[PDB]
């Protein structure tokens, strides 16, 4: 029924070439070449990002969609791209990242970009069962894509359900991935969360067209259904005649070193 649900259905009908072209059509992409080479050779002091996630969070942060301050908690940190980005910001005092890091799930990577010493990584942790703790900035980048819209809806509502427990503790800032903002139950949960905690959902330009993910952030407030549909309209427009044309941009390079007294 929603424009987004139609989008998912049409997405699944695309042929191999069209899907490949479609996913990167008119999107922005950071050049990960140098970063990947450094990481692969064991370099930990060049300030390169451990994943594409660092650039994603930087985009939100640099334009006020989320302030990174004080005690930061990163649910589903994976390799740690968001933890390292937050750790390098002066306003941040500490970072706790939690992730599964098991059975194929990315484990935290160890590099020494600025503030690596203020991050405490913990793997083998299912954040749905992790007891909420008080923090100032809450981050969560969880949401596994599924060809089934019903399934993406279920996974998204589960993430928001868990995240609400943490926001309820009282947080100033947040940036939470919403896998399928186009699903009706999700739209309603977002409207309820907005009334309780404020914020709104924003589409990151670094996201590929093959996913409708948007992020629930604290730095702005807008009409949820309107903006989710604006993104649905954009995604459907790009599916008409995929060019695979991408805009390459410089990846994030952070300063290096420990943050000491
Ligand atoms: N028409 C197509 N749609 C595709 C394809 N691969 C993915 N998708 C769609 O994009 C969505 C995002 O894909 P992404 O690779 O970024 O996320 P996942 O790694 O979690 O993909 P899954 O949703 O987990 O799918 C697993 C695999 O299943 C295959 N798959 C998934 N959907 C399809 C379809 N519709 N047609 C053909 N083959 C399909 C494909 O090889 C996928 O890699 C996915 O949920 C699908 O709705 C594809 O080859 N063709
Ligand atoms: N229930 C759960 N508990 C903890 N971690 C989970 C989880 N479900 C998924 N994850 C992890 O969440 C991560 C999402 S990808 C996160 C990327 C990160 N923002 C970066 O910048 O690198 C994956 O590693 C996935 O394994």
Swiss-Prot record:
Signal peptide: none
Membrane topology listed for this record: Peripheral membrane protein
UniProt modified residues of type Phosphoserine: 51
Location in the cell: Host endoplasmic reticulum membrane; Host nucleus
Site entry (Essential for 2'-O-methyltransferase and N-7 methyltransferase activity), positions: 141
Binding residue positions for S-adenosyl-L-methionine: 51, 81-82, 99-100, 126-127, 142, 215
Record: active site: 56 (for 2'-o-mtase activity), 141 (for 2'-o-mtase activity), 177 (for 2'-o-mtase activity), 213 (for 2'-o-mtase activity)
Effect of residue 17 to Q: In strain: Isolate Brazil/YF-VAVD/75 vaccine and Isolate 17DD vaccine
The record's account of how the chain is modified after translation: Phosphorylated on serines residues. This phosphorylation may trigger NS5 nuclear localization.
Ranges for domain mRNA cap 0-1 NS5-type MT: 1-260
Site (Essential for 2'-O-methyltransferase activity): 56, 177, 213
Site, mRNA cap binding: residue positions: 8, 11-12, 14, 19, 23, 145, 208, 210
Primary role: Replicates the viral (+) and (-) RNA genome, and performs the capping of genomes in the cytoplasm. Besides its role in RNA genome replication, also prevents the establishment of cellular antiviral state by blocking the interferon-alpha/beta (IFN-alpha/beta) signaling pathway. IFN-I induces binding of NS5 to host IFN-activated transcription factor STAT2, preventing its transcriptional activity.
Binding partners and assembly: Homodimer. Interacts with host STAT2; this interaction prevents the establishment of cellular antiviral state. Interacts with serine protease NS3. Interacts with host TRIM23; this interaction leads to NS5 ubiquitination.
Full protein name: RNA-directed RNA polymerase NS5
Provenance organism: Yellow fever virus (strain 17D vaccine) (YFV)
Biological classification of the source: Viruses, Riboviria, Orthornavirae, Kitrinoviricota, Flasuviricetes
Complete-protein stretch covered: 2512 to 2772 of 3411
């Amino acid at each position: 029924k929603t424009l987004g649900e139609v989008w998912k259905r049409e997405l699944n009908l695309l042929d191999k070439r069209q899907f490949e072209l479609y996913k990167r059509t008119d999107i922005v992409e950071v050049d990960r070449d140098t970063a990947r080479r450094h990481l692969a050779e064991g370099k930990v002091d060049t300030g390169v990002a451990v994943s594409r996630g660092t650039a994603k969070l930087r985009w939100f942060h640099e334009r006020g969609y989320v302030k990174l301050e004080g005690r930061v908690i990163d649910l589903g940190c994976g390799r740690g791209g968001w933890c390292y980005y937050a750790a390098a910001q002066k306003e941040v005092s500490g970072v706790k990242g939690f992730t599964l890091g098991r059975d194929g799930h990315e484990k935290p990577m160890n590099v020494q970009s600025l503030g690596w010493n203020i991050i405490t990584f913990k793997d083998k942790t299912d954040i749905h069962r992790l007891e909420p703790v008080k923090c100032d900035t809450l981050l969560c980048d969880i949401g596994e894509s599924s060809s089934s819209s019903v399934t993406e809806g279920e996974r998204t509502v589960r993430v928001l359900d868990t995240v609400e427990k943490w926001l309820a503790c009282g947080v100033d800032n947040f940036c939470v991935k919403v896998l399928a903002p186009y699903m009706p139950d999700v739209l309603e949960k977002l409207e309820l969360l907005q009334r309780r905690f404020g914020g709104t959902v924003i589409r990151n330009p670094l996201s590929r067209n093959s996913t409708h993910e948007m992020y629930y952030v604290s730095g702005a407030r807008s009409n949820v259904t309107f903006t989710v549909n604006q993104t649905s309209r954009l995604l459907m427009r790009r599916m008409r005649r995929p060019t695979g044309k991408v805009t390459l941009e410089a990846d994030v390079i952070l300063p290096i070193g420990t943050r000491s007294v």
